[PDB]
Amino acid sequence: GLKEQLASMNAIANVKATYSINGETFQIPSSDIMSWLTYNDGKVDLDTEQVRQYVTDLGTKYNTSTNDTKFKSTKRGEVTVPVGTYSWTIQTDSETEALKKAILAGQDFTRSPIVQGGTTADHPLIEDTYIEVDLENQHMWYYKDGKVALETDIVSGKPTTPTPAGVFYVWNKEEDATLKGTNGTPYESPVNYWMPIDWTGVGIHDSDWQPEYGGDLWKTRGSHGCINTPPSVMKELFGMVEKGTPVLVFGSH
Ligand SMILES: *C(=O)N1C[C@H](NOS(=O)(=O)O)CC[C@H]1C(N)=O
Ligand SMILES: [Cl-]
């Protein structure tokens, strides 16, 4: 029905296609959609090459796997936390087909895109719940639904083997575990509570062996990378922190 197909083309061009990605919300411009419209051998469709470009660019713009994260810190205002293990990436070919299908349906819509990674793009990467590790002030907070639920001085890694910055997360929890390391070569360390955040096996754990925790102590008594924590505190922390909670670690540019 050419009559019907042309009415289809009208509708399609007039669709309000809205994306919600990492918190930002926006509408795909009507001019971009009229561009993409096609009609060939009696079939209405969209120019895949062009739609795929658009979706590729969404990736370039928004992907938390390749774009750092602006973070409102506790002591320093808005800082930039670099990419880490807690991230996601838009799957270009899946999203391209999904977006075409949505648009050719010709009904107004909102979507967040198809991604692969630690969470989805339907919400901002960081929300009201997270662990903040301010490496400069050498101090750590656990925020839960907006409010600080616990805080403490810590000891980061020594300057030869420093704690890296990035948007990390608690990917596992383990009790009475025993960690392996290197110095001239092999060594060990038993720990009551262990929460890794990184793929090189950085993580947050208790320290019997650190007598005090604070400001300068890291320069001489620093760790191999991990975040040494008061044992009375670390227990109480492991108690309240769900697996999957993000951990933001940062120091001064
Ligand atoms: C964390 O950086 N690691 C885990 C483990 N514990 O470190 S600590 O005893 O210095 O606090 C061993 C070293 C290191 C690693 N390379 O896994
Ligand atoms: Cl991995």
Return d(Cα 241, Cα 43) in angstroms, integer.
Answer: 54
Ligand 1 atom with minimal separation from the 207 CA: 11
Q: d(Cα 6, Cα 39) in Å, to the nearest integer? A: 9
- For a mutational test of ligand 1's pocket, the pick from 178, 179, 195, 217, i.e. the residue with the most ligand atoms closer than 8 A to its C-beta, is 179
Looking at the CA of 199, which ligand is closest?
2
| 3-class SS string, 10-61 | HHHHCCCEEEEECCEEEEECHHHHHHHEEEECCEEEECHHHHHHHHHHHHHH
Backbone phi, psi, residue 210, to 5° = -95, 115
| Least distant ligand from the CA of 200 | 1
> What domains appear along the chain, each with residue ranges and CATH number?
1-127 (3.10.20.800), 128-253 (2.40.440.10)
Task: Tell me which residue of 123, 138, 136, 140 sits closest to 248, measured CA to CA.
Answer: 140
Q: Which helix (H) or strand (E) holds 97?
A: helix 92-104
d(CA 98, CA 105): 11
| 63 close to 117: Cβ distance less than 8 angstroms | no
* Ligand 1 close to Cβ of residue 189 (< 6 A): yes
Q: At what angle do helices 92-104 and 48-62 cross, to 10 degrees?
A: 120
Quick one: how far is CA 76 from the chain centroid? 20
Largest Cα span, the chain: 81
Closest CA to 120 of 198, 18, 20: 20
Closest CA to 233 of 172, 162, 155, 163: 155
Please tell me the distance from the alpha carbon of residue 103 to that of residue 51, in angstroms, as a whole number: 11
Nearest alpha-carbon partner for 81 in 196, 171, 168: 168
Q: Does the CA dihedral 121-123-125-129 come out positive or negative? A: negative
Helices (H) and strands (E) in the chain, counts: 6, 18
The token pair that represents 50 in the structure block: 């062009």
CA-to-CA dists, residue 207 to 8, 203, 211, 215, 226, angstroms: 67, 12, 8, 17, 10
Contact 19, 114 (CB under 8 A): no
Give 161: exposed, middle or buried? Use CB within 10 Å, 0-12, 13-18, 19+: middle
Which residues touch 239 (CB under 8 Å, ≥6 apart)?
none
Which residue bears the tokens 């980061």? 156
Q: Are 107 and 63 in contact (CB under 8 A)?
A: no
CA distance 126 to 32: 31
Question: Helix or strand or coil: residue 140?
Answer: strand
Ligand nearest to the backbone CA of 201 = 1
Beta-ladder partners of 168: 247
Segment holding 190, helix H or strand E: strand 187-196
CB of 228 closer than 6 angstroms to any ligand 1 atom: yes
Distance in angstroms (rounded) separating the CA atoms of residues 60 and 65: 10
Q: Which numbered atom of ligand 1 lies nearest the CA of 187?
A: 12
Nearest-angstrom CA–CA distance, 242 and 249:
18
DSSP state of 165: P
Closest by alpha carbon to 46, among 1, 13, 16? 13
Is 113 buried (19+), middle (13-18) or exposed (0-12) by CB count in 10 A? buried
Instruction: For ligand 1, say whether the CB of 247 is within 6 Å of any of its atoms.
Output: no
Can you say how many angstroms the Cα of residue 191 is from the centroid of all Cα atoms in its chain?
A: 27
Determination technique used: X-ray
- The vertex-89 CA angle with 93 and 172, nearest 5°, equals 135
Cβ atoms of 245 and 238 within 8 Å: the answer is: no
Torsion of CA 164, 170, 173, 176, to 10 degrees: 20
